[PDB]
Amino acid sequence: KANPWQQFAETHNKGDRVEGKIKSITDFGIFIGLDGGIDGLVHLSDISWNVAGEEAVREYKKGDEIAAVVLQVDAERERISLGVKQLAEDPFNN
Numbered sequence: 001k002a003n004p005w006q007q008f009a010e011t012h013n014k015g016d017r018v019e020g021k022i023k024s025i026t027d028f029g030i031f032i033g034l035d036g037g038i039d040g041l042v043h044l045s046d047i048s049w050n051v052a053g054e055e056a057v058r059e060y061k062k063g064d065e066i067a068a069v070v071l072q073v074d075a076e077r078e079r080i081s082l083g084v085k086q087l088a089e090d091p092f093n094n
Contacts, residue, residue: 008075011038020065026053032080035063038070040080066094 011033018038024031027048033039045053057065068084 007033007036007039010034010036011070011073011075013038014071014073015069017067017069019063019067021063022057022060022065023063024057024065026057028054032066032068038073040070040073041078042080043078 016037018032018034020032021034026045028046030042030045030053031040032042068082069087070080071083072079072081074080
């Protein structure tokens with residue numbers, strides 16, 4: 001909302017576990033971060049297969065969406081990488 005640079009220092013973490021925020025939207029830059037923890041971004045979601053996640057995410061809760069760990073994240077490169085995929089598989093997929 002204001003002073004986005006204050007969060008740029010919060011993404012300096014590495015090796016912790018965060019959760020996807022619902023404050024963001026699909027097909028418009030998916031962002032995944034914590035209230036004061038790290039923050040992520042994904043502009044590649046601007047393509048989508050057929051439907052927009054704007055609705056699928058509208059069903060989630062406050063701060064609910066996904067769950068993973070943040071190991072590498074750049075505010076200038078906008079490159080976010082999680083280890084949730086290396087941690088273990090799952091019975092479902094987002």
